[PDB]
Structure formats: structure tokens, C-alpha cells
Symmetry: D2
């Protein structure tokens, strides 16, 4: 069965950028539920597959994508952040970013635009296009995961579901986007990029 990963830092480690309450609820309630729901859903799919029940399989897709994606997305997200993060990546990811976006600030501007642009619940992503061999910005609705729905390998995700910022930033998603750069774990993003 899938499991809720531990946080590589405590709930208030990202203060004052993302407050303690947001982190605690996001991980212990939101992500926790996705995992449990995912396990239930995956087990039902095993029964349906074994029975050759195509209708049941299709009927289960929404739950599998939503909770499955919820697990995939947040799992990556936690590793994308750090109390000791911020700044700019060091090395090959930085050169890749300059190459594909002109500069690191233009890139930030682009990911910010995509993230703030999401109508409703969603995610902003910096991903890697293997078919083309370059970085690419993308946005996904609800919990639809980047790789499973677009083929892009996720490097850095920005959760723009209201639960990710409302307590502290209310409706001002732009301020949440501005603040988050201060806690991005570029070493993790770099490692994800190098794994490509």
C-alpha cells in the first residue's frame, strides 16, 4: 500500500513564508486523505480488473486520478521545499534554465504567470520535456499529475489550490507565489532534473 511520506522538516520550518498551520493541515489532513483514498481505490481496481469489469474500471478513473495524483503531487511538493532553500539552483539546472527561458528571473516570471493563471484548483509546474530535450512550464487542473497526463517529468511544482495559501494570503495568490521562492529546495529540483 502507498504511504504518507514524512516531511523533511517540521510544520513551521517554512515560516514566515508558508505558515505552520497551512503546512500541518496540508500534510496531515489533505495528503493523508489522498493516500488512504488511493489505497481504497487501487484495491477496488484490482477486483474490477480481475473480474474483467470494464465499467467498474472506468467508473473508478476519477477517484484514481484525483487521489493518485494528489499523492504524487504533494509527495514531490514536500521535497521541493526547505527551510534552507531559496536563491537560485547551482549547476546544470541553472544553465538549462538560462538556455530555455533566457534567465532565472524570466523563468520565475513564467512559472508565476502559469500558477497564478490557474482558474480553479490546480498546480503550476516546471517540467522536463524528454521528447524535445528541454525545460517546459505547464499547469494542471485539480490533482491531475504532470507526468501521467502530459508526459513531462515534474521538477518543481507550485500547488495553487486555495488550501495551500488562503489561511495566510487569502485570495492574493500573487503574494503566495512571491513568498514561495524563498523556500524552494533547488537542490532537490536539480536532482530531479539530473535524473532526466
Amino acid at each position: 500500500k502507498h504511504s504518507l511520506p514524512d516531511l523533511p522538516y517540521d510544520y513551521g520550518a517554512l515560516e514566515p513564508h508558508i505558515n505552520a498551520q497551512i503546512m500541518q493541515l496540508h500534510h496531515s489532513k489533505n495528503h493523508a486523505a489522498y493516500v488512504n483514498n488511493l489505497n481504497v481505490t487501487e484495491e477496488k481496481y484490482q477486483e474490477a480488473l480481475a473480474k474483467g469489469d470494464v465499467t467498474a474500471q472506468i467508473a473508478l478513473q476519477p477517484a484514481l486520478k484525483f487521489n493518485g495524483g494528489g499523492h504524487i503531487n504533494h509527495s514531490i511538493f514536500w521535497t521541493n521545499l526547505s527551510p534552507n532553500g531559496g536563491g537560485e539552483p547551482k549547476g546544470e539546472l541553472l544553465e538549462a534554465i538560462k538556455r530555455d527561458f533566457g534567465s532565472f528571473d524570466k523563468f520565475k516570471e513564467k512559472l508565476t504567470a502559469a500558477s497564478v493563471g490557474v482558474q480553479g484548483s490546480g498546480w503550476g509546474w516546471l517540467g522536463f520535456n524528454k521528447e524535445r530535450g528541454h525545460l517546459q512550464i505547464a499547469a494542471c487542473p485539480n490533482q491531475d499529475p504532470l507526468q501521467g497526463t502530459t508526459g513531462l517529468i515534474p521538477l518543481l511544482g507550485i500547488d495553487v489550490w486555495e488550501h495551500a495559501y488562503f489561511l495566510q494570503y487569502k485570495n492574493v495568490r500573487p503574494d503566495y507565489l512571491k513568498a514561495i521562492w524563498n523556500v524552494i529546495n533547488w537542490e532537490n529540483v536539480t536532482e530531479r532534473y539530473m535524473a532526466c
Copy 2:
């Protein structure tokens, strides 16, 4: 030109069921934003329309539906609530609910389920089906409006976007659904209903 309607009560009039900060922000920021963008999008659509720019018209659809829907949904939502609402509805509305759902309690359970089941942002709705002549429950994603996307006439809507309840109920949407029944303005729902029988 569309405008932000005033709430028919103070921001804290629905406490303790829906707190004041939630109402204040939902109204003055959220709703206001939709109306602002709606007027912006409508004008751009008027320019594209007059120029025969079909590509522009199509590119503007998401913004028009999102903000236009946002204006429609919240305008209705404000009137659906009241510091003097709650309780069980009476009159023909109640009789209609018993016919199509069995009882008011069964209806509540049905709308609660449709509302809690929305993945992501959306709305739960009790609407009227003009084609078949009865009540019908439906759910809508993001700000997609009930009538414009399903043909059903909206009677009562429950906003399940997280901004409508997170500050107070966190991720426990079910508690929000349970609390909101205490502030439903059944008199308004009745008026929207009676307006269909016509």
C-alpha cells in the same frame, strides 16, 4: 455594465455558521474580482465580435465563462442565505422536495453528497428542470454556471470552493455543509421556484 451587488445583511450576520472574515473576503474580494473581469472580458468580446474575429471570441471563452459564471453564481448565493433563514422550508417548495426526493431530510443528504463529492473547486445546486417539470440536483466545476451549462434553473447553490469555508472548517467540507443549512433563505429559494411554475 455589471456591478457587485450589496449583500442583504452585514458580513457577520451569518455567524456562527459562516464567519465574518469568510463573508467579507468572499464578497468584497472574490465576487468583486469576477465582476471586474466580466466587464473587461465582455468589452473585448464586443470588439472581437464587431471585427469578425472568431479566434479572439473563442480565446475569450474561458475568461467569460469563469468570471461571468462567477458573477452569476455568487449573486444567487448571497440571496440564498439569511440570518433569519434555516429550518425546514414550508409551502409548495417543501411539497415539491418531498415529491422528487422523498422528504426534506433525504433532499439535504442528496445535495450534501453532490456538494461534498466535487473534486476540486465547484458548486452544488438544487435546480429546476423545465423540460421534465421537477427538481434536480447537480454539481458544477469551478465557476461554470448551472443554467448556462446544464439548462437547469438555479434555486439553491452551495459554494464548495475552499475559499467559502477553509478559514473556518479547514478541509472538513462536511461540517461546512452541515452548518450552512442553518442559514439557508428558503423564502428566496421559494421565489426562484415559483418563478419556474410560471
Copy 3:
């Protein structure tokens, strides 16, 4: 593994309403492919499920729904037609239809409207709503199956993908809809209704 059902009549049995070529291609090529694709897809899903590969599972949903639905839909469709069909159902389905649509002709008008109204590829359906205990008309895009995506139990489906009528009716879907009533196997639809 899933299998292509045999037709309960020959390819030209529905002439002059749906010509022989349409039927032969529809069954031996179109439906045949959906089954094969479905088996491939279902087997990949078994591997992904066993590996706990949520991304692979999600990435496979389109293929499973499309081909799985393709199999479900056409399987029902073949049983919904007959060289000896047409007319009106006899018994409880007829009373159900009068009750829910006023009359059999109003019902035909409704299913026709829904079917002809499909923008792009799709299906028109007469289904049964168990939650409400009544008949209900619905339309589904591409191969999305009725029950798996709406919960309604399929009774009669009208395939409005262009391959289902173009050879004979070209773009005139309304004429195809008019002609098909002559070969509807109402005994099968009735049996599907009674099974509810």
C-alpha cells in the same frame, strides 16, 4: 481476455436501413480493434497496479476508457438491432416510456434530438436512472460508456460516430436516425429494462 461477440445476424441483414458495408466494417474492423486494444491496455494496467505505478495507471486511463468503452458500447449496440426489429416495444418498457416521455413518438423525438445534437463523435442513449427509478435520455462523447461515466444503465444506444452512417447517409445524420428505428430490437431493449 475480452472477445469480439458474434453478430446475431449477417452483415447485410439490416439493409436497406444500414447497408452491409457499414455493418461489416463496424464490426470486423472498428469493434475488433477496440477489443484487441482493450486487452493490451488491461494487461498493462495489471503490471502497473502490481508495481504501484500510479503515474502509469493514470497515463493508461484514456486508452482504457476509449477502447474499453468502445467494446461496451458496440457490444450493446449489436444486440439493440435486428433484421426483424422495428415498431414499438411490447409491455412494461412501453408503459415506462409513455410514463416518462408522454408517448413513444415523443421519446423517439427526444433520443433523435440528443443523438443528432452530438458535436463530434459520440453516442445517444436511452438509459435507466436507478437512483430516481425512471428512464432518461443521455449523450456520451467519443466512446465514453454510459454506465461507467453517468451511472445510467444502458438500454438503447445510437452510435453517431460518422463511421456508423457516412457511407450511406453522408453528413445527413438526421436521415440515419430516421432509418434506424426500423431495425431496433425492442425485445432486447425490453430485456435490458426488465433486468433493471
Copy 4:
């Protein structure tokens, strides 16, 4: 008012690659229908717009995008074909394709894949990404237009709705994709391309 453009060649000018009955029907019936409905939908949108009827505007979106897109896609499609087309493109267009896809053959394989992979009705497109300055392949469902829904400028589109090939190729879409390369008007694609460098 939108109108049905004339084809720049006779209905059977693309034979034996795309037969005459397919072209005649595709143009005079299919396309004509989209333009007819587009003019109908546009006027209704103008009435709703002027009345501030947001619900109506939203309810009209599917029809506007479907028929408007249908007009846009086919108008471009007709110009993308020619009895004197086919072969490998030359000039800067060819040089651009080699840069972003490797070679013309690899590009063909890519567009063929995107086109054959469309589930249901749709279009395959070679478009220009103004943001990143290069060519890009994309697929669109039903009649959703490339530019209006993705922002990419259409250079070459391949209609994969069954009406575009069924009469001749039946369900073997791959044979249709292989045949259509013999009638591609690379001079037109070049003009649409050159129009972006600007």
C-alpha cells in the same frame, strides 16, 4: 458576415489521394454548415451581449466554438492542399523543420503520430509557437481551433474527422495520412510561417 470560401481547385483536383466525393461533400456540406451556424450563433451572441445576458453568452459557447472553429479549421485546410503540392518543402520552412524536428521525414512521422492518435474527431496541426520562437505539433479535439485554444499559429492542419477520409480509406487513418502528404501545398504553409517571423 462569414462566407464559404471557394476551393482553389476543382473537387477532384486532389485525386487519387483524396477523392472527389470526399472533397465535394467536405466543402459544400460540412464546411458550409459550420459557416451557416457561425453566422446564426454570432448574431445571437450579439443580442445576448447587448442585453447583458451572461447566461445566454455562456450557453452559446459550444455552438460558437464548434462552428466558428469549424470555419477557421477548414478555411485553412483548403489552402494547405493543392494538385501541385506534395514533395518535400524547400526554403526556410524546410530549414525550420530540420531545426525543431531533425529532418522533414521525422517531422512527418511526428505529425502523422499526433494525427493518428486522436481519439474520436479532431485535427493534427503543425503550428508556430510565438512565445518560444519555434515550430510545434499539436492535436485538437472536434473543431476546437488551434490558435484560439492553444495560442499556436496554424501552419498546416490535417483533418482527422472520419468524414475527411472514411469513404476512401475506411478506418485505416494511417493510409489517409500517408496519401495526404502528396497534396500538401508547402508554398501555403511557407507563407503562414513567414507571416510569424514578422
